[PDB]
């Protein structure tokens, strides 16, 4: 007396709910700097996403936000590019508006993809990252070439500035999803206690 | 204006809900013989379980049922024993009644832990499994020693019989959990469509 098709549909609705919940949790962990909680939530979101074979436009945006935050968190930490270069590719392909905040995050990631290699002492890789991404170019390459890690350009387009701008974007995702089914029902149980 | 403690509590309530949902899904996948769906649900349950640091008596039983089904599914197919020997250790330690069905499943696993090695042509391992687990003993060892894989003893304590008895136990878990929060709410959304 069990309809396998309706059971599979109920599991797909639940996977959709779990996906929103885990995106919300990943967003808060990234915002709060809770690295281990972020790693755990990311592993759970990655597994839950395998239970989905067809995704709506909203669900695709959700998984790409998750993948983007994952590469940003791996920034310092089957692809022959660095995590920040992979975050840059996701960022430019997400179905989202290219507003002032989008360009700021984009430019901050482009410079930090070079600066994190210099911070780690791998200047040959910083030049390779620069070549994959890029008069301004000749000056930026001269700065990398001279190992001028703390140049005022790198102090303006800093890692802290990249993280703050990404965190302000995360706040918009967090507010948009804070009302999703699973977190909303969980908060009511906690508030009733 | 956000209370981090109440957010962590809401995430713990949701992890508890996801755990029951994934146990239900793992049970149905095992029952239906949907190997790939089982592997996917197991990976999701394993990740979700990391989001829990304190478990109730009910939650511990749930994760041990999941671990038990996982070893049974890996039966053919950091521990120096076979998957069926690991299932046998979980089975004898779960907080559950040792009724007639429990002994039947236990004895079927003990013989199948030997017979799956013989089926795979590894008779030295079948003897090693036998030594770790065990006049009856001398006769069972003579059967392994003579590579008598299809002896009537092994035909009575068969793999199909072990799977059928485990599946009848899974039906009791499935009925006990079929009413849990997440699957119940998901079925209502599917029924309203
Ligand atoms: C300066 C400012 C913020 C941060 C930061 N925020 O989140 C994270 C990790 C993502 C997993 C935690 N780091 N790091 C440096
Ligand atoms: C190990 C390594 C990488 C990953 C990963 N990559 O992207 C994502 C997103 C969060 C869910 C989609 N996770 N997960 C586990
Ligand atoms: C005889 C009878 C039943 C079965 C069987 N049931 O479930 C499974 C796998 C657990 C993941 C699917 N196999 N195999 C042989
Ligand atoms: C890879 C290998 C093994 C496992 C695993 N072992 O036990 C379990 C149970 C289901 C959730 C608890 N999963 N998961 C993924």
> Is any Cβ of chain B less than 8 angstroms from the Cβ of A174?
no
Residue A97 CA to residue A56 CA, distance in Å, equals 18
What are the CA-CA distances from residue A102 to residues A108, A120, A165, A193 (Å)?
A: 10, 27, 9, 41
Experimental approach: X-ray
Residue matched to tokens 């999703």: A180
What are the CA-CA distances from residue A145 to residues A128, A141, A171, B3, B174 (Å)?
A: 11, 6, 37, 47, 64
Chain A residues 122-141 within an 8 A CB cutoff of chain B: none
Question: Which positions ≥6 away from A4 have C-beta within 8 Å?
Answer: B32
Chain B residues 46-105 within an 8 A CB cutoff of chain A: 46-48, 50-51
Residue burial A134-171, b: 16+ Cβ < 10 Å; e: rest: eeeeeebbebbeeeebebeebeebebeebbebbeebbe
H or E stretch covering A88: helix A83-91
- Name the CATH architecture for the domain at A4-76+78-192: Alpha Horseshoe (1.25)
Residue A119 CA to residue A125 CA, distance in Å, equals 11
Fold of B4-76+78-83+94-183: 1.25.40
In which region does residue B33 sit, left (phi positive, over 0), alpha (psi from -120 to 50) or beta (all else)?
left
Contact B159, B115 (CB under 8 A): yes
Instruction: Estimate to the nearest angstrom the gap between the alpha carbon of A93 and the chain centroid.
Output: 13
Contact A106, A94 (CB under 8 A): no
Residue A33 CA to residue B11 CA, distance in Å, equals 17
Contact B188, A15 (CB under 8 A): no
Residue B59 CA to residue A190 CA, distance in Å, equals 18
Residue B166 CA to residue B174 CA, distance in Å, equals 12
Q: What are the chain A neighbours of B13 within 8 Å (beta carbons)?
A: 186, 189-190
Contact B59, B16 (CB under 8 A): yes
Compute the half-sphere exposure of residue A90: CA atoms within 13 Å on the CB side of its CA: 21
Return the C-alpha torsion angle B127, B133, B139, B145, nearest 10. 0
Contact B22, B40 (CB under 8 A): no
């Amino acid at each position: 007396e069990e309809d396998a098709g309706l059971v599979a549909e109920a599991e797909a609705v639940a996977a959709g709910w779990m996906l929103d919940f885990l995106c919300l949790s990943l967003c808060r962990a990234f915002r709060d700097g809770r690295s281990e909680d972020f790693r755990r939530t990311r592993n759970s979101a990655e597994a839950i996403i395998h239970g989905l074979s067809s995704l709506t436009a909203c669900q695709l945006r959700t998984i790409y936000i998750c993948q983007f935050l994952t590469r940003i968190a791996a920034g310092k930490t089957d692809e022959r590019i660095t995590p920040l270069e992979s975050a840059l590719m996701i960022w430019g392909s997400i179905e989202k508006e290219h507003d002032k905040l989008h360009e700021e995050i984009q430019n901050l990631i482009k410079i930090q993809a070079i600066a994190v290699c210099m911070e780690n002492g791998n200047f040959k890789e910083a030049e390779e990252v620069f070549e994959r991404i890029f008069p301004f170019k000749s000056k930026l390459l001269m700065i990398i070439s001279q190992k001028d890690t703390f140049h005022s350009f790198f102090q303006h387009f800093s890692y802290n500035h990249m993280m703050e701008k990404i965190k302000s974007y995360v706040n918009y995702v967090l507010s948009e999803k804070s009302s999703t089914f699973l977190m909303k029902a969980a908060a009511k149980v906690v508030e009733s206690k």
